[PDB]
């Protein structure tokens, strides 16, 4: 059998595999050509990952069928997750901060803090009074920081607003495993995916060249379920793939623009008929060296793997930590205050403790 193997590239090289050939042996043969540990390689066919024990007959692979390989080398409750450009260079939980937008000083006092993503992403959406002297600024300018290490106020990361604390134990749409955090799509059902599958998914589309181009916005991916009007608008979410794969994604304009012009290279490093450049000659029909002879997701997972909602019971209401009078939460803001005048405890919904900067940063609000 011939199967075309696409590995960090648009073109797929052919591999010879017998009827009983194991997915591990395929991942052994691809490891020789590419020189990488087999225990990090992941074979994906039609969107489904193939486990090592499986065989060609079980998979329902056929002649010239395309398989991708992708390489993969009380606790703090975190609402916010960011991409830290350094030193981490990977997605991390972040701290949510605010400042006076008029003077750029982190002293902006909020009557009531933020309740959701729109409150902290839409500029000039919130308001307060700044504690700078001779500063009139009322504008709340929210920013984020990586939480994996200390950071100067100035050193800010971008929030990945789709990445969500899986506090509802929602299973993945791709793998059915309950992970944390998870990416939640902006389709009608708010479909949930784990970040391991988001990676697998983004990479598979890069090799396939199945990215979508929002003309004004750029190139993106919709929900994995194919849902309409679910393109990821916040394109910094592709930073999650890491630099190799992000870098690849950025080069998609170049490569599509060349595709539209009628251009075509099949090297792993990089008028009607030689790479010059890299220096490697090849056929244009089959992409071989110079010499031309010789996608769905399951419905049951899709129903379960939605952000959806929880019907209120018992989450809905909690007694005041100090005085015990029931308080029900309004919106997603964790910052509770007590109307009982002999008490008036400001506390955190989630932690059950007095309100403070840690709760604020880790989870001023929750989704
Ligand atoms: Zn960091
Ligand atoms: Zn100010
Ligand atoms: Zn998954
Ligand atoms: Zn969806
Ligand atoms: Zn080349
Ligand atoms: Zn050829
Ligand atoms: Zn109270
Ligand atoms: Zn808290």
What does DSSP assign to residue 306? B
Write out the DSSP string of 172-221. Answer: PTTT----SSEEE--STT-BEEEHHHHHHHHHHHHHHT--EEETTTEEE-
Look at the alpha carbons of 313, 317, 322, 323 in this order and tell me if their dihedral is positive or negative. Answer: negative
Q: Give the CA angle between residues 164, 75, 97 to the nearest 5°.
A: 55
Residue found under tokens 């990952």? 49
Would you say 323 and 103 are in contact if contact means Cβ atoms under 8 Å apart?
A: no
> Which ligand gives the minimal distance to the CA of 192?
4
What does DSSP assign to residue 235? G
Q: 3-state DSSP call for residue 317?
A: strand
CA nearest neighbour of 312 among 291, 293, 326, 295: 326
> Which ligand gives the minimal distance to the CA of 340?
7
Write out the DSSP string of 255-293. Answer: HHHHHHTT-----S-------------B-SSS-PBP---
Residue found under tokens 């979508």? 212
> Which ligand gives the minimal distance to the CA of 47?
3
Residue found under tokens 């998609």? 252
Would you say 346 and 335 are in contact if contact means Cβ atoms under 8 Å apart?
A: yes
Distance between CA 66 and CA 52 in Å, rounded? 17
Method of determination? X-ray
Ligand 4 centroid to residue 182 C-alpha, Å: 14
CA nearest neighbour of 329 among 277, 276, 365, 285: 365
Ligand 3 centroid to residue 318 C-alpha, Å: 33
Neighbours of 19 (CB within 10 A): 8
CA-based Rg of the chain, rounded to a whole angstrom?
A: 25
59 assigned ligand-binding residue: no
Range list of β-strands (E), the chain: 2-6, 13-16, 41-45, 48-50, 65-71, 81-84, 90-100, 108-109, 129-130, 140-146, 158-159, 163-164, 182-184, 192-194, 212-214, 218-220, 317-319, 326-328, 335-336, 347-348
Ligand 8 centroid to residue 347 C-alpha, Å: 8
Would you say 279 and 127 are in contact if contact means Cβ atoms under 8 Å apart?
A: no
Would you say 67 and 43 are in contact if contact means Cβ atoms under 8 Å apart?
A: yes
Is 198 exposed, middle or buried, given 0-12, 13-18 or 19+ CB atoms closer than 10 A? Answer: buried
Ligand 1 centroid to residue 240 C-alpha, Å: 13
For 63, half-sphere exposure in the C-beta direction (CA atoms, 13 angstrom radius) is 1
Tokens of 211: 């990215």
Neighbours of 93 (CB within 10 A): 20
278 assigned ligand-binding residue: yes
270 assigned ligand-binding residue: yes
Distance between CA 16 and CA 26 in Å, rounded? 9
103 assigned ligand-binding residue: no
Query: After what residue numbers is the chain broken, C–N > 2.5 angstroms?
Result: 73, 264, 270, 273, 276, 291, 294, 314
Is 219 exposed, middle or buried, given 0-12, 13-18 or 19+ CB atoms closer than 10 A? Answer: middle
Distance between CA 119 and CA 133 in Å, rounded? 26
What does DSSP assign to residue 40? G
> Which ligand gives the minimal distance to the CA of 185?
4
Sheet of 13-16, strands arranged across:
13-16, 2-6, 65-71, 41-45, 48-50
The residue annotated as part of the active site, out of 59, 84, 100, 333, is 333
What is the structure's resolution, reported in angstroms to one decimal? 2.5
Would you say 356 and 365 are in contact if contact means Cβ atoms under 8 Å apart?
A: no
Residue found under tokens 């839409």? 122
Active-site residue 333, yes or no? yes
Tokens of 321: 């930590």
What does DSSP assign to residue 170? P
User: Both ends of the chain: CA-CA distance in Å?
Assistant: 49
265 assigned ligand-binding residue: yes
> Residues with Cβ < 8 Å from 46, sequence gap 6 or more?
295, 296
Would you say 19 and 1 are in contact if contact means Cβ atoms under 8 Å apart?
A: yes
Ligand 2 centroid to residue 103 C-alpha, Å: 4
Structural domains of the chain, ranges and CATH numbers in brackets = 1-74 (3.10.20.90), 78-367 (no CATH)
What does DSSP assign to residue 153? T
What does DSSP assign to residue 132? S
Ligand 4 centroid to residue 186 C-alpha, Å: 7
Distance between CA 356 and CA 345 in Å, rounded? 12
197 assigned ligand-binding residue: yes
């Amino acid at each position: 059998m011939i199967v075309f193997v696409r590995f960090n590239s648009s073109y797929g090289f052919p591999v010879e595999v017998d009827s009983d050939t194991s997915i591990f042996q395929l991942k052994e043969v691809v490891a020789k050509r590419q020189g990488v540990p087999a225990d990090q390689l992941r074979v994906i066919f039609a969107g489904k990952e193939l486990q090592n024990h499986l065989t060609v007959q079980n998979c329902d692979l056929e002649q010239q069928s395309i398989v991708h390989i992708v390489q993969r080398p009380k606790p703090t409750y975190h609402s916010f997750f960011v991409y830290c450009k350094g030193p981490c260079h990977k997605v991390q939980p972040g701290k949510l901060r605010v400042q006076c937008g008029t003077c750029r000083q982190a002293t902006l006092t909020l009557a009531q803090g933020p309740s959701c993503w729109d409150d902290v992403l839409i500029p000039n959406r919130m308001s307060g009074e700044c504690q700078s002297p001779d500063c009139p600024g009322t504008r709340a300018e929210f920013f984020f920081k990586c939480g994996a290490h200390p950071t100067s106020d100035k050193d800010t990361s971008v929030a990945l607003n789709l990445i969500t604390n899986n506090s509802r134990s929602i299973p993945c749409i791709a793998c059915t495993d309950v992970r944390n955090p998870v990416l939640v799509f902006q389709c009608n059902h708010r479909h949930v995916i784990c970040l391991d599958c988001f990676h697998l998914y983004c990479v598979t589309r890069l090799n396939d060249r199945q990215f979508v181009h929002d003309a004004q916005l750029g190139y993106s991916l919709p929900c994995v379920a194919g849902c309409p009007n679910s393109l990821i608008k916040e394109l910094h979410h592709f930073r999650i793939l890491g630099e190799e794969q992000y870098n690849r994604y950025q080069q998609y304009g170049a490569e599509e623009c060349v595709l539209q012009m009628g251009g075509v290279c099949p090297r792993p490093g990089c008028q009607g008929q030689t790479c010059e450049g890299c220096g490697f000659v090849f056929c244009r029909d089959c992409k071989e060296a110079y010499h031309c002879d010789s996608y769905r997701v399951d419905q049951r997972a899709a129903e379960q793997a939605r952000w959806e909602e929880a019907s209120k019971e018992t989450k809905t209401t909690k007694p005041c930590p100090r005085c015990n009078v029931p308080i029900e939460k309004n919106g997603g803001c964790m910052h509770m205050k007590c109307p009982q005048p002999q008490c008036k405890l400001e506390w955190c919904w989630n932690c059950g403790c007095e309100w403070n900067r840690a709760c604020m940063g880790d989870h001023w609000f929750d989704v």
